[PDB]
């Protein structure tokens, strides 16, 4: 439980995190379906309890860069990823900052508002400075 | 002139509570972008003339040859579903622009 | 003024957790990037608007 896994349940092959649901299914049901008609929960066939299925956490990787005509130093955004999941992969950290946009790595958070330069999103921007 | 102004702004508040159609342009934009993502997700359930929509139903019972025939319909259909969504979203982006 | 920015893993949408579907998708080459460049082009503009 609470781990990303390749599951199979009575022949329902798939991949994701498994979790203990609060959803009650009536006795004849075995899969849970979301509005999209996509699967979102399953019953355990041995200890008849309902389990939520959630995606293994994933996102775009964006590299924030000054010009190569300026530097080799770069920062990386893992979009909509919670910082606690990037240690799995720069996972040394030393400079890590978590935002509404995801986890930003290799950039120094500074309280001073400057004018926007490279747009990160969710009110955040980045730039190259002393 | 001020009392008319003050009364008129009161009527804006009262009106915006009252009418559901007021913000209709904005809601119709949300509804279209949402409808297109739910449409794009529901296309994953389509068979495209394959024996199943579920990728491992095809792989688990077949060899490299018969799987390539079957999976290549799903790749065709799903790529055609993205090229559809992105065409709609590009066209819809020009309306928003 | 704007709409929701949307970005898609063309590989995860077509082929989620299958190397086989990935290798068959390579037969079509750059189309997944062409789509992602377009959705990025939309998404960037939403800030501009």
């Amino acid at each position: 439980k609470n781990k990303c896994v390749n599951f199979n349940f009575n022949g329902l092959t798939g991949t994701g995190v498994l979790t203990e649901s609060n959803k009650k299914f009536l006795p004849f049901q075995q899969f849970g379906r979301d509005i999209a008609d996509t699967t979102d929960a399953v019953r355990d066939p041995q200890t008849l309890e309902i389990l939520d299925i959630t995606p293994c956490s994933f996102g775009g990787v964006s590299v924030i860069t000054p010009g190569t005509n300026t530097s080799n130093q770069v920062a990386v955004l893992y979009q909509g990823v919670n910082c606690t999941e990037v240690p799995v992969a720069y996972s040394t950290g030393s400079n890590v900052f978590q935002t509404r946009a995801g986890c930003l790595i290799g950039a120094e958070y500074v309280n001073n508002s400057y004018e926007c330069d490279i747009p990160i999103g969710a009110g955040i921007c980045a730039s190259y400075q002393t | 002139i001020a009392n008319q102004f003050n009364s008129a702004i009161g009527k804006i508040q009262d009106s915006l509570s009252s009418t559901a159609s007021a913000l209709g342009k904005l809601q119709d934009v949300v509804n279209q972008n949402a409808q297109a993502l739910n449409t794009l997700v529901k296309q994953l359930s389509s068979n495209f003339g394959a024996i199943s929509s579920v990728l491992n139903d095809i792989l688990s019972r077949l060899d490299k040859v018969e799987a390539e025939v079957q999976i290549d319909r799903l790749i065709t259909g799903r790529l055609q579903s993205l090229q559809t969504y992105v065409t709609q979203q590009l066209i819809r982006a020009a309306e928003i622009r | 003024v704007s709409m929701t920015k949307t970005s898609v893993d063309c590989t995860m949408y077509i082929c989620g957790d299958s190397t086989e579907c990935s290798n068959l998708l390579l037969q079509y080459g750059s189309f997944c990037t062409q789509l992602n460049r377009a959705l990025t082009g939309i998404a960037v503009e939403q800030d501009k608007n």
């Binding site: 994701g16 999209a36 996509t38 959630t54 995606p55 994933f58 996102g59 775009g60 979009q79 909509g80 509404r100 946009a101 926007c116 747009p119 999103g121 969710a122 009110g123 | 913000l23 904005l26 809601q27 949300v30 993502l37 739910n38 794009l40 997700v41 994953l44 | 704007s2 929701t4 920015k5 949307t6 970005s7 898609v8 893993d9 063309c10 590989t11 995860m12 949408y13 989620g16 998404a43 939403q46 800030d47």
Partner: peptide, 25 residues
């Protein structure tokens, strides 16, 4: 106004937060 993850579809945040838009307004 009254307002997918596991299929690779992701909703990116706007650059201006609804606070920054309240500021410019």
């Amino acid at each position: 106004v009254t307002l997918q993850k596991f299929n690779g579809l992701t909703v990116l945040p706007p650059l201006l937060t609804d606070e920054m838009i309240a500021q410019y307004t």
